[PDB]
Scaffold this active site. Structure first.
Site, PDB file in Angstrom:
ATOM      1  N   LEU A  90       0.000  -0.192  -8.920  1.00 40.65           N
ATOM      2  CA  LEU A  90      -0.928  -0.614  -7.844  1.00 40.65           C
ATOM      3  C   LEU A  90      -1.985   0.428  -7.453  1.00 40.65           C
ATOM      4  O   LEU A  90      -3.136   0.100  -7.116  1.00 40.65           O
ATOM      5  CB  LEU A  90      -0.095  -0.985  -6.622  1.00 40.65           C
ATOM      6  CG  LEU A  90       0.855  -2.170  -6.819  1.00 40.65           C
ATOM      7  CD1 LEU A  90       1.723  -2.409  -5.599  1.00 40.65           C
ATOM      8  CD2 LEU A  90       0.068  -3.422  -7.147  1.00 40.65           C
ATOM      9  N   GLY A 103      -2.012   8.299  -5.274  1.00 45.38           N
ATOM     10  CA  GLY A 103      -2.722   9.337  -4.565  1.00 45.38           C
ATOM     11  C   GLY A 103      -1.787  10.395  -4.038  1.00 45.38           C
ATOM     12  O   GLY A 103      -0.664  10.098  -3.632  1.00 45.38           O
ATOM     13  N   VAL A 119       2.231   4.312  -6.497  1.00 46.40           N
ATOM     14  CA  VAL A 119       2.711   3.043  -5.945  1.00 46.40           C
ATOM     15  C   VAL A 119       2.735   1.960  -7.034  1.00 46.40           C
ATOM     16  O   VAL A 119       1.745   1.736  -7.704  1.00 46.40           O
ATOM     17  CB  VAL A 119       1.882   2.540  -4.753  1.00 46.40           C
ATOM     18  CG1 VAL A 119       2.566   1.334  -4.118  1.00 46.40           C
ATOM     19  CG2 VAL A 119       1.731   3.636  -3.703  1.00 46.40           C
ATOM     20  N   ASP A 146      -6.258   9.813   6.349  1.00 43.53           N
ATOM     21  CA  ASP A 146      -6.631   9.127   5.106  1.00 43.53           C
ATOM     22  C   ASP A 146      -7.016   7.675   5.385  1.00 43.53           C
ATOM     23  O   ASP A 146      -6.697   6.772   4.601  1.00 43.53           O
ATOM     24  CB  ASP A 146      -5.479   9.221   4.094  1.00 43.53           C
ATOM     25  CG  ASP A 146      -5.921   8.987   2.647  1.00 43.53           C
ATOM     26  OD1 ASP A 146      -7.101   9.196   2.279  1.00 43.53           O
ATOM     27  OD2 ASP A 146      -5.055   8.595   1.839  1.00 43.53           O
TER      28      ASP A 146
HETATM   29  N1  LIG Z   1      -1.657  -5.128  -4.044  1.00 45.27           N
HETATM   30  C1  LIG Z   1      -1.515  -3.829  -3.664  1.00 45.27           C
HETATM   31  O1  LIG Z   1      -2.246  -3.019  -4.203  1.00 45.27           O
HETATM   32  C2  LIG Z   1      -0.531  -3.373  -2.657  1.00 45.27           C
HETATM   33  C3  LIG Z   1       0.246  -4.311  -2.019  1.00 45.27           C
HETATM   34  N2  LIG Z   1       1.169  -3.984  -1.130  1.00 45.27           N
HETATM   35  C4  LIG Z   1       1.398  -2.712  -0.750  1.00 45.27           C
HETATM   36  N3  LIG Z   1       2.253  -2.228   0.101  1.00 45.27           N
HETATM   37  C5  LIG Z   1       2.137  -0.920   0.138  1.00 45.27           C
HETATM   38  C6  LIG Z   1       1.185  -0.534  -0.711  1.00 45.27           C
HETATM   39  C7  LIG Z   1       0.661  -1.688  -1.336  1.00 45.27           C
HETATM   40  C8  LIG Z   1      -0.333  -1.999  -2.303  1.00 45.27           C
HETATM   41  N4  LIG Z   1      -1.071  -1.037  -2.934  1.00 45.27           N
HETATM   42  C9  LIG Z   1      -1.196   0.361  -2.523  1.00 45.27           C
HETATM   43  C10 LIG Z   1      -2.015   0.448  -1.217  1.00 45.27           C
HETATM   44  C11 LIG Z   1      -3.434  -0.046  -1.472  1.00 45.27           C
HETATM   45  C12 LIG Z   1      -4.133   0.839  -2.513  1.00 45.27           C
HETATM   46  C13 LIG Z   1      -3.357   0.739  -3.831  1.00 45.27           C
HETATM   47  C14 LIG Z   1      -1.896   1.193  -3.589  1.00 45.27           C
HETATM   48  C15 LIG Z   1      -1.883   2.658  -3.105  1.00 45.27           C
HETATM   49  C16 LIG Z   1      -2.688   2.781  -1.799  1.00 45.27           C
HETATM   50  O2  LIG Z   1      -2.737   4.133  -1.361  1.00 45.27           O
HETATM   51  C17 LIG Z   1      -4.111   2.308  -2.077  1.00 45.27           C
HETATM   52  C18 LIG Z   1      -2.044   1.897  -0.721  1.00 45.27           C
END
Ligand SMILES: NC(=O)c1cnc2[nH]ccc2c1N[C@@H]1[C@@H]2C[C@@H]3C[C@H]1C[C@@](O)(C3)C2
Ligand SMILES: NC(=O)c1cnc2[nH]ccc2c1N[C@@H]1[C@@H]2C[C@@H]3C[C@H]1C[C@@](O)(C3)C2
Lengths: 286, 285
Positions: free
Chosen positions: B17, B20, B25, B134
């Site tokens: 996903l 960072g 993730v 952030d």
């Molecule tokens: N569909 C998804 O991407 C997604 C869906 N549910 C989630 N629940 C927790 C994180 C998360 C998701 N992604 C993360 C989120 C957004 C983006 C990409 C990932 C890492 C980040 O730092 C930046 C936080």
């Protein structure tokens, strides 16, 4: 008795199905009653340190359960000693390499995308089990029926160690270089994203109906040159570094080719996933 | 049976996903039946820093708010210090992923409603004595057309009581184009510093997260794209002179003036999240 135990004296060779430098698959009838009534099976054997590899391949396949992964049937262990043979289900229609050039009239874009989704499902399942396949090509996808394909060879499949992202390979001489991601060619590193790159090439084959004149080898050799010999891989690496890729197949929608291009990002981390590919194909099929 | 304990043998990886700050993730299915019908979850782990991950887990575990991504649990190693953070999965993803695909669905009123939600979630965090550090549109998840949630707490730190800020040590990977002058100049992070970052986040939201009009690209147009290691000092200099990100296309002046309040040079003069909420609500009536 054990139905997964195939005795050598009853396992009778009918004909070759395909062969590598160090391995081969034959059609056999397992005929313990000896009246030519036994079941037809696909039998993988080594050509007279590959025994260890084959035993690991057997243990991988035996424990994989998915409708788009070829079924393990058993083993034939050598009375003499160390040798072993992998027994699998026999699919008469053969690989996409054999099947697609013969069945062009009944296999449209829709069915090609459905095969693509099936390959992705099998690969996603394999990935979840922390395996890198390392040999994903049209030639290793078997046709179960007009509507169903199965990943049919696991000879190079390797386990990714827990909390690691890649496997490093030592024995790499029999490598399908024209299906291989840059990191594989340059550093012998194999990620799940390396299988995604390989899937993109496989998708190209499928879309071209495995035509030899449009095969990955033929098209890449046209780009780099067909008579460079032991310098082929380095020239391939250089061509990939420049950003050059296999072109869009004839009659392939740009949407499909874009999904293909998403498999071919130079950096493994920038490539798409098998699940994102399925979603993309499913959107085109709706 | 502990419903926050997730067994590794049933966690099946689907796709990455994002990543960072020493974290990664992934979307996984927690699939104890082995048939792909299990619940999808977002799983955060380190790229092969555990102390930072463990601190993040404890922070998120104790945050309960409709606009903060839900903690689900942990997957722990046996006789190891390994750990994974398990959260709810939002299939629509971040504003960064969602907004470009859904412009027709999300008009100004909805953007302001998301703005309020972000402010509510951030103000809850502030009341818990935490600085986020952030806040960007990439870290705001889309629950639905009507709801967003702050989705990552990788850099979140506690501010000591009787202190107005946290002093940062590890800063090499900071999102400098979202950072207030005090963070760039002195590595001091206030609640007001998060307000600054919210203003930048709002700018992204109003521009539908278009990369060509992103905070990075816009600031680089002002200061210069090829100043290398001197970028942050040139950024600081530009901010000192009072220059700011321009008004988004089709953003009314009254929304932009609220955004400008987030960008007062001194942290003690900036607007608050509660004040933003009131201002947005006034426009939504
Ligand atoms: N569909 C998804 O991407 C997604 C869906 N549910 C989630 N629940 C927790 C994180 C998360 C998701 N992604 C993360 C989120 C957004 C983006 C990409 C990932 C890492 C980040 O730092 C930046 C936080
Ligand atoms: N009709 C068949 O060829 C066939 C039928 N059922 C099978 N079950 C397992 C393998 C197999 C078959 N062939 C093999 C398969 C495809 C291709 C040629 C063989 C070697 C290869 O590596 C590349 C894997």
């Amino acid at each position: 008795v054990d139905p997964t135990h195939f005795e050598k004296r009853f396992l009778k060779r009918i004909r070759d199905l395909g062969e590598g430098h160090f391995g081969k698959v034959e059609l056999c009838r397992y005929d313990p009653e000896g009246d030519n009534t036994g079941e037809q099976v696909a039998v993988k054997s080594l050509k007279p340190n590959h025994i260890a590899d084959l035993k690991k391949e057997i243990e991988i396949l035996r424990n994989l359960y998915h409708e788009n992964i070829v079924k393990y049937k058993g083993i034939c262990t050598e009375d003499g000693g160390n040798g072993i043979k992998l027994i699998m289900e026999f699919l008469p229609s053969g690989s996409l390499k054999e099947y697609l050039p013969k069945n062009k009239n009944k296999i449209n874009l829709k069915q090609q995308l459905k095969y693509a989704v099936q390959i992705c499902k099998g690969m996603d399942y394999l990935g979840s089990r922390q395996y890198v396949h390392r040999d994903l090509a049209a030639r290793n996808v078997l046709v179960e029926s007009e509507h169903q394909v199965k990943i049919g060879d696991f000879g190079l499949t390797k386990a990714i160690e827990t909390d690691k992202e890649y496997y490093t390979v030592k024995d790499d001489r029999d490598s399908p270089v024209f299906w291989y991601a840059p990191e594989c060619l340059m550093q012998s590193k194999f990620y799940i994203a390396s299988d995604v790159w390989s899937f993109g090439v496989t998708l190209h084959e499928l879309l071209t109906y495995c035509d030899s004149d449009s095969s990955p080898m033929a098209l890449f050799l046209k780009m780099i040159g067909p008579t460079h010999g032991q310098m082929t891989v380095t020239r391939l690496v250089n061509t990939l570094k420049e950003g050059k890729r296999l072109p869009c197949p004839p009659n392939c929608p740009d949407e499909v080719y874009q999904l293909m291009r998403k498999c071919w990002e130079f950096q493994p981390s920038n490539r798409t996933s098998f699940q994102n590919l399925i979603e993309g194909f499913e959107a085109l099929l709706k």
